[PDB]
Amino acid sequence: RYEDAYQYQNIFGPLVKLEADYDKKLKESQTQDNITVRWDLGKKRIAYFTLPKTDSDMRLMQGDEICLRYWKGIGHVIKVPDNYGDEIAIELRSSVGTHNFQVDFVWKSTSFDRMQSALKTFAVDETSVSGYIYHKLLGHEVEDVIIKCQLPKRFTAQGLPDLNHSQVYAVKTVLQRPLSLIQGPPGTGKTVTSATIVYHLARQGNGPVLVCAPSNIAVDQLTEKIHQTGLKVVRLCAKSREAIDSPVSFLALHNQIRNMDSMPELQKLQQLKDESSADEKRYRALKRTAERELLMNADVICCTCVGAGDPRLAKMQFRSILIDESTQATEPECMVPVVLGAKQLILVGDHCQLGPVVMCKKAAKAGLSQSLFERLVVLGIRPIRLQVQYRMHPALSAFPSNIFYEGSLQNGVTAADRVKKGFDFQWPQPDKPMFFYVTQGQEEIASSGTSYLNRTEAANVEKITTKLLKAGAKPDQIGIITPYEGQRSYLVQYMQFSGSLHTKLYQEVEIASVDAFQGREKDFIILSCVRANEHQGIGFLNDPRRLNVALTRARYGVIIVGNPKALSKQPLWNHLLNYYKEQKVLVEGPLNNLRE
């Protein structure tokens, strides 16, 4: 609603300063006083130590820096808890210059420093955004601007699915306006549409197109679709994130640079570091020339929002910018890319899906909690909704459509098309591939830490896992969601033991929070709500958005396991339970029936 660029930086700036102070202090408060360690290896050394199972909102992910006290040595996170033996290892960069230590979580200001310098440029730099973007971002009243361009004859792109009418219209409209919003409800084909938009923006031959999303998962998913059109795609990664796998690692800058057959000397110097002084002077220099060569030549650059603040992008201007999953980001974050020269900006997302995590309630309250997306809807830009969904069986989409998309969501797959070829699993109701299983297990504190678990519910999950596999379900196609790290640990260990089938087969099923499932689909989803308490919840327990994602990840079937009584007290969780009972599904003790 603002009036000036300085009046803009004026408000957000002091209020990014709250996140930065809060989390820097919060960070220093998660120091572990005396965990046990062991000197291992893997030379890129690594292994290992175990840490109190404790869930959060910003959890430790690979891309975090750590320190070891009790001699003083730093290093970065190599191993993070997941269904292959939850423990933590870190690569010391000083090859140890035994065995009761102290662990610190190093605080990095980069995310915030960049957000800070973004706002500054929005103030100091006249060439940071187009006049029209400049005025509209500050909420000024401006006459609409038409973007000149040649509309393609086919709106579909090369190596991508064809578009329905809502997608076509999104593409067609987006390409002709300087600022656009596209709301993309679950499985409505957001990233296809976005990739289709990017393809067209790239065919305009007109520098690299910039493409971002607040999370790495989100970028990767979109990097994968854009690549499918054949465009030259460079995917920028946090220098910190370089050792991580993805379906698109080969597209990543650091890798493309490693495969530079045209640069001897750098190729040489690279082998040596695989093991200095004056060599460090020239390795950095050639690496920089390598980076700029690929970045300059890309059709498309894909990174995080904070990602776009990277020094390596210095002094590059991006005229077309598409940010997907914008709804998931704070304004200052989402703004980091924008200030790199935007003249055409496309924000994609859904405020009914994952929202921005703010740690400092105070900053949250006083204005850090709102998307750029949301703030613009408020300012009156009408998002284009993607109308059809292709992921789930109608009954599975019914409840989410009704709560979030005012029951308007079309179904692109008929009930016929969502019966699994070879499934031997008749459901409590012959029509609806869903149910709620009732469990009154005992709530308990973590075996080591402060998160929570539930033994009975967990027991119940594994049998539902087993039953499903036996009907013909593939392990890679089954998910299990739980709000607690507690229940996550316990699921991992337990799954293989009381599991009748082969031990690796369960070990092939993914147990994660909601964040790990963002934008991903599976054939079956199991929820573990794990509450027998009425005590305030954290996951999809007390967040509609978070819950929406959970209910909209499966193609063929969704099974919810929880205490209907201990969750009823929450305006959305009861609408859920009520709707289920009416749909003649809410059950007890397998080979079962209805419940009260």
Curated annotation (Swiss-Prot):
This is Regulator of nonsense transcripts 1. Found in a post-splicing messenger ribonucleoprotein (mRNP) complex. Associates with the exon junction complex (EJC). Associates with the SGM1C complex; is phosphorylated by the complex kinase component SGM1. Part of a complex composed of SMG1, DHX34 and UPF1; within the complex DHX34 acts as a scaffolding protein to facilitate SMG1 phosphorylation of UPF1. Interacts with UPF2. Interacts with UPF3A and UPF3B. Interacts with EST1A. Interacts with SLBP. Interacts (when hyperphosphorylated) with PNRC2. Interacts with AGO1 and AGO2. Interacts with GSPT2. ATP binds at residues 167, 187-191, 353, 390, 521. Changing residue 189 to E: Decreases interaction with DHX34. The gene is UPF1. It catalyses: ATP + H2O = ADP + phosphate + H(+). Phosphorylated by SMG1; required for formation of mRNA surveillance complexes. GO terms for cellular component: chromatin; chromosome, telomeric region; cytoplasm; cytosol; exon-exon junction complex; nucleoplasm; nucleus; P-body.
